[PDB]
Structure 1
Amino acid sequence: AEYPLPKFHFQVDWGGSRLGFTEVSGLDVETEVIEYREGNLPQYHKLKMPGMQKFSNITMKRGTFQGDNDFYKWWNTVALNTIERRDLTISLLNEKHEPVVVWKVNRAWPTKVQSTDLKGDGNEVAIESIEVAHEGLTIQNG
């Protein structure tokens, strides 16, 4: 067609009871650059070549409901250097409620859990957040 897609209809599968979230970020892939030059090159700028890869962490937010303490449980699964690891899948849906773009995350485990702030005059809900480390990510469109 000739029309783009929006970002207000998605889904996350993380091994919990609720698939709804308010914010999803940190989807990025990067590669390093190596520079090189020899003495007699008629070119005075350096040459470039691919190096190692690097992935960023994942940050997700959600509102707080009564009777739901999954973030703390997963974080507290930690032992000296061991922890439960999970496969994380994030999808993008259309108007028939089917997927369109999929991000696949291998061997995720949480590194930070942040609770809410309390203000007396605050007319806002209670927001908790988590940060996730993971080895590698993939992108599937179509």
Structure 2
Amino acid sequence: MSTPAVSHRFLVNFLFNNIPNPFDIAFQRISGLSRTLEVSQHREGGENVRNLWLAEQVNHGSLVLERGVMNASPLTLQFDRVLRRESTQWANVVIMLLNELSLPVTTWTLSHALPVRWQMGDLDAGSNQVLINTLELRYQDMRMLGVKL
């Protein structure tokens, strides 16, 4: 059987409408994409032994990203504009894992992602650590691709 996919190589591509060039930014800690369907349980009168689950509404999670405090990229300059309320532009994000050669084995492809939260790491006098800042986006739809679905 083919070997499963490990989780320490990944590219992320962003495409805003403010910014003319699509840019690719390296992260440390992409959190993880959930997708819940939100059923509800109904209880019938004469039926006491089975359950009844009724499908309603697909809920998508959130894209939480982590990287170090490095030079100003086109994405930390873009969260600065949205969190100062100077723009409300959102982007189409493409996230993909890479195998041993270079090849994309799975792709996640988020749509209309909106920057909603910046979170700075701690400043501590005895710490021995890189200052990590936490970024967080809310998207509208999600569409996973690739050969390793």
Structure with the higher fraction of residues in strand conformation:
1
1:139 corresponds to which residue?
144
Within 1, Cα distance between the matches of 2:87 and 2:78? 12
Gaps of 5+ in 1: none
Matched ranges for 1:72-83 at <5 A = 72-78=76-82, 83=88
Q: State the secondary structure of the residue aligned to 2:108.
A: strand
Separation (CA, whole Å) in 2 of partners of 1:86 and 1:95: 29
Question: Which residue is equivalent to 1:10?
Answer: 10
2-structure distance, mates of 1:138, 1:24 = 17
Q: Is the 8 A contact 2:62 2:138 kept in 1?
A: yes
TM-score, normalised with respect to structure 1:
0.85
What are the Cα deviations for residues 24-64 of structure 1, in whole angstroms up to 9, with x where unaligned?
113111011122233233x4443112111101111000112
1:42-61 equivalences under 5 Å are 43-61=48-66
Structure 1 residue 9, shift from structure 2 partner: 1.2
Aligned residues: 140
Using the size of structure 2 for normalisation, the TM-score is 0.81
- Structure 2: give runs of 5+ residues left out of the alignment: 16-21
Distance 1:81 1:121, change over 3 A: closer
Distance 1:19 1:71, change over 3 A: closer
Mapped contact 1:89–1:102 kept (Cα < 8 A): yes
Which residue number corresponds to residue 87 of structure 1?
92
Structure number with larger C-alpha Rg? 1
| SS state at 1:74 partner | helix
SS in 2 for 1:61: strand
- Give aligned-pair identity as a percent: 24
Cα distance between partner residues in 1 of 2:62 and 2:89: 17
